[PDB]
Structures are given as structure tokens and as C-alpha cells.
């Protein structure tokens, strides 16, 4: 898909399978990295712009909490990261 909501929906689900299912944080990051990189390139269409308006902040904050977690090992940081990814996943259905 080239639709941001579909790309993120598939990616978040797969990233969570790798992390929670396979216990594979390296693999999880490889799935999420390209998607965050896409966001950092910025929206290029009406629909990408609307998606960024709705979810861009939550997705960037999820990544920040996750980066915090990778240095802290604090479950609080981990859970805040996943709460945000979960939120976006549910809002885009």
C-alpha cells in the first residue's frame, strides 16, 4: 500500500508481533524505522497531510519514549511508547 494509514496499520501490528511475540526488538525497530523516516520527510498529499495532523505528534512521541526506554530499561517508558502506538493503531482501526 502507498496509503499512510495502511502502511502504519500493517507496520504497527508487525512491529508489535516482533517485539511481544518474537521478543525481537532489533526486528521491531527495522519495521518502525522506515515508517518514522517517512514521517520525517513530511506529508506530500492532502491525505498524508491530514494523517500527519491527526497522528504525527503521537507517533513521534512514541518513538521518543522508545528511545528513552532503550537507555533506561524503565518499564514506564516502554509502556508509554506502546500506549501511543496502540492509540494510533486503534484510531486508524
Amino acid at each position: 500500500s502507498i496509503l499512510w494509514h495502511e502502511m502504519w496499520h500493517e507496520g504497527l501490528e508487525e512491529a508489535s508481533r516482533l517485539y511481544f511475540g518474537e521478543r525481537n526488538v532489533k526486528g521491531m525497530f527495522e519495521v518502525l524505522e522506515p515508517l518514522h523516516a517517512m514521517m520525517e520527510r513530511g506529508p506530500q498529499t492532502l491525505k498524508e497531510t491530514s494523517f500527519n495532523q491527526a497522528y504525527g505528534r503521537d507517533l513521534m512521541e512514541a518513538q521518543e519514549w522508545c528511545r528513552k526506554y532503550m537507555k533506561s530499561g524503565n518499564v514506564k517508558d516502554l509502556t508509554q511508547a506502546w500506549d501511543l502506538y496502540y492509540h494510533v493503531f486503534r484510531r486508524i482501526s
Binding site: 521478543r23 530499561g73 518499564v75 516502554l78 509502556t79 486503534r90
Partner: protein, 110 residues
């Protein structure tokens, strides 16, 4: 032969039970043997939602929810084989072969 036990803390409506494939919405608090709270989604907070009976959650939850009526609050004691088993969930402070305790409140069924 279920590998969990359930104690009802507050009765539900005794009428509406989740079925395989339903989306349920829950409040929960999870504790270890010593009462350490490893997670709660009770306060931005909102209920956990998931499709039941398809492996979205650990087996103890997936099975127990089919026995709860809407509004029910129950204490679940889940054996490690129906939770995180030998590996546990180290990042979340769940050790190997851990029995998990959850208070679960079934808020809604879509």
C-alpha cells in the same frame, strides 16, 4: 483443565457474554505473587480493547473473558502455561514461569 481460576468480585448482568470474535473493552490491574503491580490501565486512560478468542492476548485472558458477563469484575489467577511461560516477559518485570494475577473489569462488548 482450564489453567486459570476466576473469582467474581462484582457480578455482571449475567446475560451478555463475549463470543469468539467479539471486541471487548476492559479495565485491569496485574500483580505478581508479592502484590507488585506490574501494570494497570486504570488512571488519558481508556479501556483495553481487543478481539477475543483469536490470540490477541494471553490464553488465560482469551479463555476467561468468554465466561464473564458485561459489567463483571473478576480476579483471575493464571498459570504460567497460559500466560508467558518459561520466557516470561523480562522487559515488563515478569519472570520465568510466573503465575499472574489480574483484576479484570469487562466494561463493554462491541
Amino acid at each position: 483443565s482450564p489453567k486459570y481460576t476466576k473469582s467474581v468480585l462484582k457480578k455482571g448482568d449475567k446475560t451478555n457474554f463475549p463470543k469468539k470474535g467479539d471486541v471487548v473493552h476492559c479495565w485491569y490491574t496485574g500483580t505478581l505473587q508479592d502484590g507488585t503491580v506490574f501494570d494497570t490501565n486504570i488512571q488519558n486512560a481508556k479501556p483495553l480493547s481487543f478481539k477475543v478468542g483469536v490470540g490477541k492476548v494471553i490464553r488465560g485472558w482469551d479463555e476467561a473473558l468468554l465466561t464473564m458477563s458485561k459489567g463483571e469484575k473478576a480476579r483471575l489467577e493464571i498459570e504460567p502455561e497460559w500466560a508467558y511461560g518459561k520466557k516470561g516477559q523480562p522487559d515488563a518485570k515478569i519472570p520465568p514461569n510466573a503465575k499472574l494475577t489480574f483484576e479484570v473489569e469487562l466494561v463493554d462488548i462491541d
